[PDB]
Amino acid sequence: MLIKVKTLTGKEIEIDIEPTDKVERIKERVEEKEGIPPQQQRLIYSGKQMNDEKTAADYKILGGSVLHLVLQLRGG
């Protein structure tokens, strides 16, 4: 299965993940191509904030699916 995970700047990168892989790795792959430490990686898919313990399947991720990287800020 091939998925796209839109970055925090709009840059869309595609990645290979067969269903069973945990979200926790979808992050490993992203870190691999972009250098974004997985700790600060917050993945969002259809409003659901992908729990790094569940699995791509647990979120109905299907080929043409896109995951967005988000960030919540402290200062104001």
Partner 1 sequence: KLLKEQKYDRQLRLWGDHGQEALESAHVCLINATATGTEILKNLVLPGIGSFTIIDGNQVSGEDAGNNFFLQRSSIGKNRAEAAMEFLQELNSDVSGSFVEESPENLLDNDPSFFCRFTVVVATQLPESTSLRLADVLWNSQIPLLICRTYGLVGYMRIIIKEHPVIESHPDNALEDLRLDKPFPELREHFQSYDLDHDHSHTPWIVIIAKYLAQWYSETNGRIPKTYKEKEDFRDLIRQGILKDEENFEEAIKNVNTALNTTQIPSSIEDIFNDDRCINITKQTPSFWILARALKEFVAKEGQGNLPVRGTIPDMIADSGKYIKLQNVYREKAKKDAAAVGNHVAKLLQSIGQAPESISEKELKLLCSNSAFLRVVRCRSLAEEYGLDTINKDEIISSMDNPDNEIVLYLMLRAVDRFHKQQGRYPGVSNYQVEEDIGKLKSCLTGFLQEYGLSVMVKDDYVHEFCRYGAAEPHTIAAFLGGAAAQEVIKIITKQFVIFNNTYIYSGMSQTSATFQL
Partner 2 sequence: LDWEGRWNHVKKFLERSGPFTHPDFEPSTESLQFLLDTCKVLVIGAGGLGCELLKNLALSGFRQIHVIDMDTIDVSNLNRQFLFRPKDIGRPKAEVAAEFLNDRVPNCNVVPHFNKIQDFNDTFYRQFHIIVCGLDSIIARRWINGMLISLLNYEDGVLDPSSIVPLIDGGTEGFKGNARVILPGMTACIECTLELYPPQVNFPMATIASMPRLPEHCIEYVRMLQWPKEQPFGEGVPLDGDDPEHIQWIFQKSLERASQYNIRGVTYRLTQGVVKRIIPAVASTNAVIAAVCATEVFKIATSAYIPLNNYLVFNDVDGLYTYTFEAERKENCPACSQLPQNIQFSPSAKLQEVLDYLTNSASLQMKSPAITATLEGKNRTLYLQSVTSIEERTRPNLSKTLKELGLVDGQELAVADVTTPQTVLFKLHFT
Q: Give the binding site for partner 1 (CB under 8 A).
A: 8-10, 28, 31-32, 34-37
Residue 19: both structure tokens together? 């269903």
User: What whole-number distance in Å separates Cα of residue 23 and Cα of residue 76?
Assistant: 31
Q: Which is nearer to partner 2, 64 or 76 (CB)?
A: 76
Over the range 8-28, which residues count as b (16 or more CB within 10 Å of their CB) and which as e?
eeeeeeebebeeebbbbbbbe
Residue 28 interacts, among partner 1, partner 2, none and using kind-specific CB cut-offs from 5 to 8 Å, with partner 1
The answer to whether 26 and 17 have CB atoms below 8 angstroms apart is: yes
Q: Which is nearer to partner 1, 36 or 57 (CB)?
A: 36
Residue 48 interacts, among partner 1, partner 2, none and using kind-specific CB cut-offs from 5 to 8 Å, with partner 2
Q: Which is nearer to partner 2, 18 or 76 (CB)?
A: 76
